[PDB]
Amino acid sequence: VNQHLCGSHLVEALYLVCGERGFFYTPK
Amino acid sequence: GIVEQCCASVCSLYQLENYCN
Ligand SMILES: [Cu+2]
């Protein structure tokens, strides 16, 4: 399903999706 | 970018995979 994710909620989802691999959080 | 689109619009978990290492 599509997601509406702002602020810390986006970082939560990135953590869930990427887990061990890690991720970059890069807003503008 | 995605930080913008997920919040101002919607985004999928599949789009989020683009940001994994
Ligand atoms: Cu909240």
Author numbering:
A (entry chain B): 2 to 29
B (entry chain A): 1 to 21
Source paper text:
Primary damage, i.e. photoreduction, was followed directly by XANES as a function of radiation dose, while secondary damage in the form of structural changes around the Cu atoms after exposure to different radiation doses was studied by crystallography using a laboratory diffractometer. At higher doses no significant changes in the coordination of the Cu I site are observed, whereas the Cu II site is seen to change with increasing radiation dose. At 100 K, disruption of the water structure in Cu site II was detected at doses above 0.1 MGy. Thereby, the radiation damage to the water coordination could be initiated by the photoreduction of Cu2+ to Cu+. In our structures no significant difference in the first water shell around the Cu I site was observed in the four different structures. The water–water distance also increases, from 2.00 to 2.35 Å, which indicates minor changes, in site I. However, these changes were only monitored and were not explained by the final models.
Hexameric insulin binds two metal ions by the coordination of three histidine residues (HisB10) to each of the two metal ions. In its natural form the metal is zinc, but insulin is also known to have affinity towards other transition metals, including Mn, Fe, Co, Ni, Cu and Cd, all in the +2 oxidation state. In the T6 conformation of insulin studied here, both of the metal sites are exposed to the solvent. The coordination sphere for each metal site is thus completed by water molecules, some of which are weakly coordinated and easily exchanged.
